[PDB]
Write a protein that binds this ligand. Sequence first.
Ligand code: MG
Lengths: 524, 524, 75
Amino acid sequence: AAKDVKFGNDARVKMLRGVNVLADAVKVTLGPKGRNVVLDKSFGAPTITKDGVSVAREIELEDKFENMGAQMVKEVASKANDAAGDGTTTATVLAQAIITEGLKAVAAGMNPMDLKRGIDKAVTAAVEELKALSVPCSDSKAIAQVGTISANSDETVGKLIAEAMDKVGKEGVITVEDGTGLQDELDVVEGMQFDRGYLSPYFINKPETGAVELESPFILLADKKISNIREMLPVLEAVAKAGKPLLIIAEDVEGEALATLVVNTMRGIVKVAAVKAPGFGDRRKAMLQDIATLTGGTVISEEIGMELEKATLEDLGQAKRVVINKDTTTIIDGVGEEAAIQGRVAQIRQQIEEATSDYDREKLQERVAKLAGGVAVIKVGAATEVEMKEKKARVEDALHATRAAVEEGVVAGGGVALIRVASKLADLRGQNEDQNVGIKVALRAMEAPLRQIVLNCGEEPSVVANTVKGGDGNYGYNAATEEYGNMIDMGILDPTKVTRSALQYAASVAGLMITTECMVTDLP
Amino acid sequence: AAKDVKFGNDARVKMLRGVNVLADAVKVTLGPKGRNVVLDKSFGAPTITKDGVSVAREIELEDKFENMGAQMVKEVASKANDAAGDGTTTATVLAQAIITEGLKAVAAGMNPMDLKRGIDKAVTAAVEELKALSVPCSDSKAIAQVGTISANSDETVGKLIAEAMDKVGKEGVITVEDGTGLQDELDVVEGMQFDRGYLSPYFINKPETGAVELESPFILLADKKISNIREMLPVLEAVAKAGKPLLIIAEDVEGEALATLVVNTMRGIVKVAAVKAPGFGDRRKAMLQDIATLTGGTVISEEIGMELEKATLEDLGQAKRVVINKDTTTIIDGVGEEAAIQGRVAQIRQQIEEATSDYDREKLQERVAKLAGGVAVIKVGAATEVEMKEKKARVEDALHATRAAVEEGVVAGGGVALIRVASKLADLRGQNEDQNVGIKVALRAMEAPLRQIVLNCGEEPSVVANTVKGGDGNYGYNAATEEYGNMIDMGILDPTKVTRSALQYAASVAGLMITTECMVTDLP
Amino acid sequence: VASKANDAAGDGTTTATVLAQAIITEGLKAVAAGMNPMDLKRGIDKAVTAAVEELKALSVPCSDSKAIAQVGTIS
Ligand SMILES: [Mg+2]
């Protein structure tokens, strides 16, 4: 495939327009008072939305190059969200702010390598400044606090989170299920979560979480790499007959059998999903065994002479729910009995005594943890189906901002934190006057979100900006009610993780771009 | 297929552009401080990379001719790497440097044949000069030295290499496996390596090494040419049932059966690979027998009346790993027992007594060597999967540079070594004043890499160049820390093989080009 | 610049041009940095009024036939 190669300036101009269209389509929705974007949808009526994550998802441009530009910002802003639970839009809005101004500089004939330096200093400095502005959130009170604000003034959501953390810890795995009454419920239950993701996006059955949700599934616990669907066909037949879904947790599932199970849930003949097993090498076989004990399944280890051709249902583990992500598997309520699960903890307990190294220690206690520690399920209750799966939605939003708040604290939510940290480090210098420009581009990028919220509301940016700058700490403008005040007091706050991630991620791609000299792609 | 034929000048101009596009995309990534190239990728988000080998790989132009240009420089720069472990990009960067200048000469009306003569002298001269600048790397200290530098200041990698060479010799076959603990391990084990490569690139299962890696495979040791897949079908059925991969080491595998096994691992029905047997004629049958003894396999020689239709598993040899390249097969930990393996060495031992010729001698001791000498496996340990398969990667990088340093020593890494040898032979003359231009073009080419690193860093080339030239030995400029010093002491070195290969290979293709008169290709 | 340079000393017109391309290049780059051009100008002039004094200080009279030949020659 013959490529099209663009250089230096051309490449960057293309890149820049690419980035603007993403940003101009996505930024108009930022405030509590955003504007609508209309997103056409093949059959039927268009979609009107104010949700930048949805607008972004749709953005792909004709011009390759221009497109690469937009895809690159999308990429990085989505990781912001990946690591924080929010900021996707903010990240984009900021990414445009640096990229615009940094990229004009380079084009004016200033030094790229310095501009990046400058930006990266300004970011470094403001991330610190944020740590300073940041107020911790640690106690049950504070937890329910950020929870309730994050779930929109609903004090019951704040409570349920507070309560869950209170039961399985600020680590403990907490999930949400659809509720069965009008009552909320909180139950702790045998289960576990481990850091491995689906092996193919096509497993997803609920595209709004971009996640796979299997109900009452059997669990295959194979200790080997699964290559051929041949080995499978006795087990997938027993499973199809029990009319239940199935989770494969094997060393891996490769090409053939993978693309097979993929097209097997595409037409919906048997709903299935597979994920790699937790950990590697020596501590894998132990860890797989743990999930066995948890779900009362039999581990099929080729190192004792058992094929998957010799496996009936009786071998498969079983849990009342499982939910997989891009990068997480979480098994909820495992049927494996407490006679066993406790016995195993008693085994592992002892292995800690016969530990002679520290790395051999933590690794055994992360195992005792996952297993005896459990999974806390919140059932969201409500009056109507609509309410319910709306409330269920905000409960996951809050849980997200809270997990986040715990880790790094909260700050002024209206853009305000960024506006603030910027007016503090308005002496900053570098050595090159090129590095200064870099610092200033970065600094003035930091007002972008506030300026944007204001704008979207149809008030004046410059004026609200200038008055937010004039104050201190968490004084800000609350665009929803048009009052100035203490943004935190007035219930407008961002987790510290999320404002920072946003900024870091925006700065990363901007630097990347200010230092791109060449762009390869296919022929129109 | 009607062709498009271009002559002398046209030809060369097309070639020139062709090579520039390759070089200008590729060269911006050269320093420790390179710039990014964005490489679009069909579905999903683009790839940002600083890695010249990746950028090169993608370069293909629309204008055939122009494309031919770029393809020729890629060809040759990749062989540099083939023979040294590095320089792919440098070779390209120097390639452009000569081609540009020499090609201007021809066009100005000077004599091609002389310009090539000149360049080739300048190279010849500097290759020598390089041998002089070269500091040997021979003792265990020096080995760990270049290893640690080459694995990025990690003293433990230096050690492990130093230790392997120390057990199986600076020749001895040394491989790397994924580690199973947090601990690195070094084991010597019955095994062997021989100079034959995969019979089809489609066997590759790990495209980043461009290599085939089979786990616990059975080994077919056939002494004949395998043409028909008919002869195979009993053995491939026994193998498919034991759910293990299979290595064919026969005289050859041809057309039919080859394109068969190829499309048989394409859809992943049975993972298989085949490679020609080591050596030819009389000493082949002996050498094949050695691998039999090593893996406890049975050799299927048609000269005793045994078909592949009469071969069950019990005939196939077996080893714990095998890894094949473009041009190497290496068999790790063969199950063939020490009762046999030692016995075979005692047999071959005696054959050396009944040697009456010298060529009949070395050929028997290369056989005693491969067999009793064994294969040294490094297992790379680490904390997390990511770390591990990153550490594993650097261990193979260093192993490469070290093997290379051993053979020809190390020199100033920064571009420096070339900058130096060039300022030494700045009297050089030829006979034509044409050849003089040849020598100059060549010499001034030699600054290219240093100038480029500096330039990528966003410092001034001319100035760092001039000050490196003003020094001696390995004094140079370390672009990463902007300090002049002794490039080797400061840990910025290139194996001698690699700087030389880069130069020679760039000079070859430049000559080739400066002496091309015609260019044939298909119609647009 | 080149033309005035010339009506003034019949020489140095290229220098002149070279200097302007140079003030301009750099000066625009600074306008792109978001400096106020009106001030960029004032500083440029101050710089120059200063440089002219400096020159009159380095200047030594040329009045022997030898130096005269040297300016001729160089010109
Ligand atoms: Mg003059």
